[PDB]
Design a binder for this molecule. Structure first.
Ligand SMILES: [Fe+3]
Ligand SMILES: [Fe+3]
Ligand SMILES: [Fe+3]
Ligand SMILES: [Fe+3]
Lengths: 238, 200, 238, 200, 238, 200, 200
């Protein structure tokens, strides 16, 4: 079974977005009004699932092939790759990285999305993988299109891919969104701007990575992820 | 002072979280193996229980697009991190509220008692992380059990909640659903009866 | 008795901390949600107690001697001294200055403080004096230690001494906290940061004062206090 | 414009205020002379009264660690500023909420009427300043008396409060404690029935 | 036995303090007036003791517990931790780190210290450990207080902890003093100022390390140590 | 040019060095194992000798608070680096001047000859590092023996000292203490008869 | 930290100091009242004594242009600050060494014992400040008396001089000059027998 043998650096909740960010209108009614209650780390918080033996399908990381209905999806072929490390710079190997996104036109394969841009019959928009023994992950996909949403009267999300990362414990688990280098929608988005610190916003912007591209084939973007620093316990209960 | 690399900042899981993390709930095809809401197979030791609940916003309206992750000890009070669909028990699961099914469910066993880092027993609990549209960083809470009153009164974590009235928000209500033992645990994100949320 | 013969410069409530400063968690439920109601100064507000006839014990200003249970307290021997003036620079003489603090390890002599750092059998942590005829006050004490508190999961107050100053009226009365020059905890503290303006925060930082030290004995810190400016009434009721 | 020296900024009095300002309450030995809650000797002129109250946060929970300073005219409408433990009457005093019950008390006389700066009589009142953990700058209020309705209706300070409903929050309720004349003045810092707080 | 198999980068004796620094008065008569004589490295200088087989007591690194006479010492509970590396950045594992200090009030437990600040019956002021296999060390202690000394008429040492580090050879062995981030006494001290280069002084200032703190318990400071670079011999005797 | 990480700068060991490094001398309790001044058990191979000396400042006054570390080959010319209180011989030790008399002592064996890096034999020597209040970076020296005159005259390290007169400062004088073979090595930090100090 | 106005920096009094401060010694006309070397008129109580001395530089050569100021208690141990040429005793005086007269003199009484700030008696002493060409800031010293050995051994100021040999530099030597009691006090600014100089 899992053991309590590590502690995780406390989150900076002014680096993350706060709960109440009213320009993102849905946050107004979905933010707690009472303060969070701080509790000490116990085995409940410092452990979590390890997915080394989850069974992955051959194409689970390849969105060009994992919704194949007779053709390739339309849109900008890209590799999205990166490393997961903790705040001490230590790689996070064999960790679960899940991602999902709209198609090249900003349309999601969900019944609730009625945006007029069409679905792509060969694109589903869902990926997963484990990081390797050195902390690296890789997906192949179509660059998602921006899409409009019912916030302000003319609001458009920048192109984005959602990411979920498990890490070593439930204390490290994170959902975030990847944006793309240069996108002029980034500075305008009230969801991006839920993050108060502009330096923190920059951490979510994937960089064009020509070094990792396949010539005559696909481009590549690099998105590195930093989870809470993990340290051994010291001088406790004495 | 010493400044480490900053953590990647959180963002909302958004309205379509289920397409990535709750494929069946999204009404989409599933892969061969999915992480879902059945923590215990029938052969798992312990008291088999159904958990269920609804999630409400600050206007008292149902949240029909939430995504929940849970982490709990087995009936012996051990956390099982080796996730495998072949296991009779997994400590981790996922569930969701959707337009068609506004009440999430989990199929599990009642967790055993786990000590805190100082060696003091915590009352039986399930750790929950809540994600949704409008939620910029996920909300952490705990589900405790109304039939563990003596343990709950002594739990070092519940006792860090300054007001007794707020402790009551974390106590799930025993009932029966289709002739089996169940506990209802509603979450109120904001306002009247606001659920206690933790930082750690 | 007291008479109404002066007016006090209106407070700048953007220089002071605002009531609602949610990173200081207890302020969330203890801040009014309605606006303060402005009222004109009358004799009720422009008068207040004078403490010239309060009886002070010999050691009331000397925390090294006022809780003597067989020895001296452990910790950094310091004089804390300064001048109380109003905003026009006028000294405020014969005014009551009270102070209280934790011991060298950050433990308070209060039944509600269960921090594991020990009490000091020869330290109580409370002082009082009057300013002299030129507006100066003086205490002798131990430098308090920082101490953890149940706000965020790893929050620590900088070393601090609480001050209360009466001044000429109930309109001037103030409670504040003194911090110490260079303390690296100051920029991190959510109570310090309840003050929005960085220049106002600087006003709470006592400076090392070698000129006032007793060689081979104790160091000294200087903390000057500025109360609301007092002026005569003019052109009223005409 | 003309900018004077800035005032020293306020900070919270903190949860341990009572060790500097309410020594009995901290659980600590007192000094020979303390500034406390008995403003009137038995020989003081006027009507001897008990004041008492509880203080509530925005969740309706007792504030158990609050510290209050009061300033009032004597029965003849005179402010006695020469503070002295030997005085028949002190216009100034201090009190604090008990930690178990949360209730503060003051022993005083009913204040006489004093005029505002324009020469208009104010209704009998006690000036109060409230300090506590969570309160970054103290809150000013006034306690008026429910058996002075005629004077209250004409008070130029009460009439600066735009809404009659809010004026009611400053009116203490006559009662009897141990058979003796008392007035209860509860303070609600936030929310329903929020007490009027002043700036001046 | 030991063998000569490495060379150590020559010391920069303008980065170190010089011998004669007259504002530190005792250095005037205890500094050589003749030049040091340079000698080449031999086995005598490039070897030194290793302490892997020295027996350490359970609390040798823990000054909160190693002088226990019925209670805890008074003062600011802190972890002091860091890494010992050489100038090429290589960790120095299994090396002896010794430290000693005054108590919270600046009083030393030494028969020759008659400063009037009291001794703490539960504080001794001495620690030792070995660095681990990755070069890291850790102590737990009380933050020492500044203390006056008989140099100029009003001289005060900043808060400081003495360190001794063995390293791989007698050529690497060092004694130094750790100071604390922000201490306003640092720029004033004639012993600190024995170091001519301000950048070298900065190398002795431990930084507040909130990441390593134990919430509700103790703070932490980080002090990394750099010993002379070690290289293999090359092209010698040919 | 290539600039490596700078070395941590030295500071004086201070007047209270003995509390960290010479606990007996500080007047303090010792730990189970201490690194001190008896390098050789009685069974150690070689000629057992006492070393002793006093340390003088530039005014000719005793340095009463000095701390010395020594490093020497065993009698067979081997450096024993695996420090252990159970060893017959340790190549490393520590000593300190007594505060009354100022005299340090070491119990050891006469070191055997080792070669320099060019393969040339060095005369028998003890490497010494001197620390004290007033000494900002420790002073390195060597103790050689006056009954090794032939070897001393050919030592490639002694011959790096330009002046014969200065070479004499490193030659310890054979004597007898309690009837036992000893060598006295006084150090003069500054001025007349200043001891040679090395850089390497 | 708190930084006050900086003190005006010292400079040497220069080769012609006597024209400003020692007019007779400069061989120049004097004014009606001069501050000079006769602290005691014949009628002053106490033991009348002559003090004399020479001043030497670091090469052992006479300083023939020095200027000295002295401050001492009267025979009762009281400092008399009301300087007046009519007084039988003044606590302050001036003297000099010149080309014609290389040995300064003072005519005074032996000072009584004065306590330090902690109430501990200091041995009888004269405070001296020495100025000259080549001296950038004046040198402070004290003249004590060789016939006060018991008091000197207990003086809290002499005992702050770490070395007993240096304490001897402050002890003036009793003699007789023209049949009257005298003490010789030579000052050596630098080198062999260097006089102790103070900072305060
Ligand atoms: Fe989206
Ligand atoms: Fe505090
Ligand atoms: Fe020291
Ligand atoms: Fe000139």
């Amino acid at each position: 079974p899992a053991q309590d043998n590590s502690r995780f650096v406390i989150r900076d909740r002014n680096w993350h977005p706060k709960a109440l960010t009213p320009d993102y209108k849905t946050s107004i009614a979905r933010s707690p009004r009472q303060a969070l209650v701080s509790i000490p780390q116990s085995i409940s918080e410092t452990t979590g699932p390890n997915f080394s033996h989850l069974g992955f399908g051959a194409h689970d990381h390849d969105l060009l092939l994992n919704f194949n209905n007779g053709g390739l999806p339309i849109g900008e072929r890209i590799i999205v790759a990166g490393r997961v490390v903790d705040q001490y710079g230590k790689p996070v190997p064999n960790t679960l990285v899940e991602m999902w996104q709209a198609n090249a036109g900003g349309r999601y394969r969900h019944k609730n999305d009625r945006y007029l841009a069409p679905l792509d019959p060969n694109f589903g928009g869902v990926g997963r993988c484990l990081t390797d023994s050195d902390g690296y992950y890789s997906f192949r996909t179509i660059k998602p299109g921006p899409h409009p949403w019912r916030n302000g009267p003319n609001d458009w999300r920048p192109a984005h891919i959602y990411f979920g990362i498990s890490g070593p414990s439930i204390a490290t688990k994170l959902i975030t969104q990847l944006y793309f280098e240069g996108d002029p929608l980034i500075p305008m988005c009230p969801i991006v701007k839920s993050i108060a610190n502009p330096e923190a916003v920059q951490q979510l912007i994937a960089k064009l990575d020509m070094n990792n591209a396949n010539p005559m084939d696909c481009l590549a973007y690099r998105f590195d992820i930093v989870l809470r620093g993990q340290r051994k316990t010291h001088f406790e209960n004495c | 002072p010493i400044e480490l690399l900053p953590e990647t900042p959180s963002q909302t899981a958004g309205p379509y979280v289920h397409i990535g993390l709750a494929l069946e709930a999204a009404g989409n095809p599933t892969r061969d193996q999915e992480i879902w809401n059945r923590l215990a197979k029938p052969d798992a030791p312990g008291e088999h229980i159904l958990l269920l609940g609804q999630v409400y916003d600050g206007n008292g309206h149902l949240v029909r697009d939430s995504f929940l992750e849970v982490w709990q000890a087995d009936a012996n009070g051990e956390y099982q991190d080796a996730y495998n669909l072949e296991n009779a028990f997994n400590s981790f699961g996922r569930t969701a509220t959707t337009f068609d099914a506004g009440e999430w469910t989990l199929h599990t066993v009642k967790p055993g008692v786990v000590n805190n880092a100082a060696g003091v027993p915590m009352a039986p609990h399930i750790n929950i992380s809540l994600f949704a549209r409008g939620i910029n960083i996920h909300l952490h809470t705990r589900l405790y059990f109304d039939d563990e009153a003596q343990a709950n009164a002594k739990c070092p974590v519940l006792n860090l909640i300054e007001q007794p009235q707020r402790r009551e928000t974390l106590i799930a209500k025993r009932c029966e659903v289709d002739g089996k033992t169940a506990y209802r645990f509603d979450i109120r994100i904001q306002g009247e009866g606001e659920t206690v949320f933790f930082d750690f």
